[PDB]
A paper describes a structure:
To improve our understanding of WcbL, we solved the crystal structure of the enzyme to 1.78 Å resolution. The structure was solved using the single-wavelength anomalous dispersion (SAD) method, using selenomethionine-labeled protein to provide a strong anomalous signal. The solved structure reveals that WcbL adopts, as expected, the GHMP sugar kinase fold. Native crystals formed in a number of related space groups in identical conditions, and determining the correct space group was challenging for many crystals. Native WcbL and an AMP-PNP complex had a lower proportion of the monoclinic fraction: for these complexes data did not process well and the model did not refine in the monoclinic space group. Comparison of the sequence with galactokinases reveals a Q-L mutation at position 162. This facilitates the accommodation of the extra carbon unit in the heptose sugar compared with the hexose substrate of the related enzymes. The native state shows a structure with strong stability: most of the structural elements are built from hydrogen bonds of 4.1 kcal/mol or greater.
Author numbering:
A (entry chain B), B (entry chain B): 2 to 346
Amino acid sequence: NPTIIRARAPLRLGLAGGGTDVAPYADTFGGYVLNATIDRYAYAVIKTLTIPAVRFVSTDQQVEKHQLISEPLELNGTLNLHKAVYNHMIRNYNHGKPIALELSTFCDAPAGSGLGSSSTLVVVMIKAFVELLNLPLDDYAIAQLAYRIERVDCGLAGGRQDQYSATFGGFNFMEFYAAARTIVNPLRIKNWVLCELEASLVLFYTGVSRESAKIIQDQSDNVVSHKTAAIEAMHGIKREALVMKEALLKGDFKAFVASMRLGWDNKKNSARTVSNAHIDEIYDAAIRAGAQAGKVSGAGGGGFMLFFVPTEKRMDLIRTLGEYDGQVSNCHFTKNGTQAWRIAN
Amino acid sequence: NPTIIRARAPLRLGLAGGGTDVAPYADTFGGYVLNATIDRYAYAVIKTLTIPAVRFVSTDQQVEKHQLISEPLELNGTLNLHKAVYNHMIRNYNHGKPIALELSTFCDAPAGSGLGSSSTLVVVMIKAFVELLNLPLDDYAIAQLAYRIERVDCGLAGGRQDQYSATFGGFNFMEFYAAARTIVNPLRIKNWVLCELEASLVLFYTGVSRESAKIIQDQSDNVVSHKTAAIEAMHGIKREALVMKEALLKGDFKAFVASMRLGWDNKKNSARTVSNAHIDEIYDAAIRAGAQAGKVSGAGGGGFMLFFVPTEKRMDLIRTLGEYDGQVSNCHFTKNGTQAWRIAN
Ligand SMILES: [Cl-]
Ligand SMILES: [Cl-]
Ligand SMILES: [Cl-]
Ligand SMILES: [Cl-]
Ligand SMILES: [Cl-]
Ligand SMILES: [Cl-]
Ligand SMILES: [Cl-]
Ligand SMILES: [Cl-]
Ligand SMILES: [Cl-]
Ligand SMILES: [Cl-]
């Protein structure tokens, strides 16, 4: 009888520091990122098959089907991450002997939403295989493996923060250093601070961003080509991540919003397409309505925005965002990282 | 220096049984309701004032301001629930001596959303006063007090389930009997069942319902005027609440969806405006896309719908709902009931 396994991993809001985790900056100066997992998930499912075949199904419902062969699967550009995860697991834990299965993914947010879905989907595929094969991989190992698969095996350029949020869960302050060295600091935030933060945050989905790869490229170029003003903006991103971390540990909401404002200026000045006329218009309207600070969650150029608003202006801000193109939602944080369960066998 | 208190209480999805908690049915036959709190909240805030005044602010930003007087506040039709909570608390715990404060509310969903916000807002106002005055009210007492304030003091007709979800939190099966007797059964659902359910539910907000008071009136009339077929539909609502409860405890998803389907037919047959052409169109399209069952969350006539969809059809259902008028979201349950925190003093 077939085995059915599912895994999920929470998506994440980038609170501060994003951009300092791009390869040249982190390797040169050290990066800081403060992020927190929310109540939206990426999912993977493994179904063992009774036919000699392997099948891959994606979130946007692309589908590939291959015969069971004893060579690694080619990374031909269709579903490369699915195939690279499968390839690593067969080679390293099944002695190169293929397994007949279907590996499928789905997600509560599309790519370019700014919630780290791309890397979270790699994590959850890994977790589904950890459960299938009973592997002793710890959280650092899962996060590092996800990074290797996406950035090396599949050669996709990007950041370092999303693998860690997806694996560990909760509020984390991450330190990124040269030679793939990362330190995760789980933040033990007081219950009243978490409730006050949730009561003060409004999310707004502005549509899919098509700028992430560009922004990351520009930020990497700032360091390589010595663009002094742009590197200094990045230095500001880094400083304010620490300021925001300490404000949360101290329950200091005045310092939290001051740091988000400074951080948002810095982020916009680090790469040309982080914001635009359309985002700035939403941002200006939110401030007019009573929001104190805000930012694009991910790399920039669209996707989710978050706003900090005092509770007496919250409904006014919700009403105002109603006039603009996008979807309003509340913000609820999750403490758990990636997890798996079984349905058959 | 002023004291600032906030409280929140989670909103709820009606899974089964709704309608059997209307006064004539529950009092005559006994009602059953299965519900579960989600990641959306109603909030109340108390701010002590340094001027001799009392101020009330609502979710839709109505505002009333009164001089500090030693008579109960009149329930003139503007912000009656706010005033009735304040009145009860001053009379019963402050010896009839007024307190200078501002009592404000806000909510993650508007009235008529089908998530129990009206009664949840009464609960959260009560909780804010429990925290202000350090009252020893237990959960049964908070739920009963909320019911009395809304239904008796303020004479607003309605159900019995929302007070209990808002106060207790989590998944509960409630038994409603004559003489205001209610038994709350917290369901201790297995972790894999909760994850599988979340992975299988899609929410869809269709807009504000204006039918709730009408549906509840019609359901109450079915019993009083002996409308045999309509009472029998209500008997079916009740039966299937129990079937669904037991399916969750057993992790039996086949029985869960079969019961939701039967329950939805029953609910539509119990009152004429529970569904309509527009809801049926969304429902039919969801089924076409691969959903197995679904229902309006609250009394009916609009508000939130929920769909059960096998994971392999989830993205297809999300895409399809995209074609219709309303907002798609995931479903994440919360285990905690109402809670409070302090900001100043
Ligand atoms: Cl960031
Ligand atoms: Cl995918
Ligand atoms: Cl994303
Ligand atoms: Cl992202
Ligand atoms: Cl970010
Ligand atoms: Cl119901
Ligand atoms: Cl209100
Ligand atoms: Cl509601
Ligand atoms: Cl409701
Ligand atoms: Cl209901």
